[PDB]
Amino acid sequence: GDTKEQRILRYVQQNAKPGDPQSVLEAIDTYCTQKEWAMNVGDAKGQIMDAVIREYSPSLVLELGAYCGYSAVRMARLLQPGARLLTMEMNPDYAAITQQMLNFAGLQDKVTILNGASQDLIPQLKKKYDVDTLDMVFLDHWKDRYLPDTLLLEKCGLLRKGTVLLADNVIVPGTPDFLAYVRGSSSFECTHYSSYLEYMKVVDGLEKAIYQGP
Ligand X SMILES: O=C(NCCO)c1cc(-c2ccc(F)cc2)cc(O)c1O
**3-state class percentages of the chain: helix first, strand second, coil last, to nearest 5:** 45, 20, 35
Q: Which of 43, 63, 135, 140 binds ligand X (CB under 6 A)?
A: 140
Is 87 near ligand X (CB under 6 A)?
A: no
Question: Closest distance between ligand X and the C-beta of residue 132, in Å?
Answer: 27
H-assigned helices in the chain: 4-15, 21-34, 42-56, 70-76, 92-105, 118-121, 125-129, 146-155, 176-184
Q: Which helix (H) or strand (E) holds 137?
A: strand 136-139
**140 has catalytic annotation:** yes
Q: Should residue 207 be labelled a site residue for ligand X when binding is judged by CB under 6 A?
A: no
Residue of 29, 63, 140, 149 that binds Mg ion (CB under 5 A): 140
Total residues at the site for Mg ion (CB under 5 A)?
Answer: 3
Should residue 204 be labelled a site residue for Mg ion when binding is judged by CB under 5 A? Answer: no
Catalytic, 154? Answer: no
Catalytic-role residue among 198, 204, 207, 208 = 198
Residue 63's binding partner among ligand X, Cl ion, Mg ion, none (Cβ under 5 to 8 angstroms by kind) is: none
Closest distance to Cl ion from the beta carbon of 161 (Å): 28
- Is 36 labeled as ligand-binding? no
* Binding partner selected for residue 71 from ligand X, Mg ion, Cl ion, none, CB under the kind-specific 5 to 8 Å limit: Cl ion
Neighbour count for residue 210 (Cβ, 10 Å): 18
**Per the residue annotation, which of 143, 204, 207, 208 is the catalytic one?**
143
The two beta strands, 136-139 and 60-64, are parallel
Radius of gyration of the chain (CA): 16
Residue 205, interface with ligand X (CB under 6 A)?
no
Q: Distances from the Cα of 104 to the Cαs of 18, 46, 70, 80, 189, in angstroms? A: 5, 19, 12, 19, 37
Core vs surface per residue 24-48: b (16+ CB within 10 A) or e: bbbbbbebbeeeeebbbbbbbbbeb
Binding site for Mg ion (CB under 5 A): 140, 168-169
Tell me which residues are annotated as active site: 140, 143, 168-169, 198
Q: Which residues make up each annotated binding site for S-adenosyl-L-methionine?
A: 41, 63, 71, 89-90, 116-119, 140
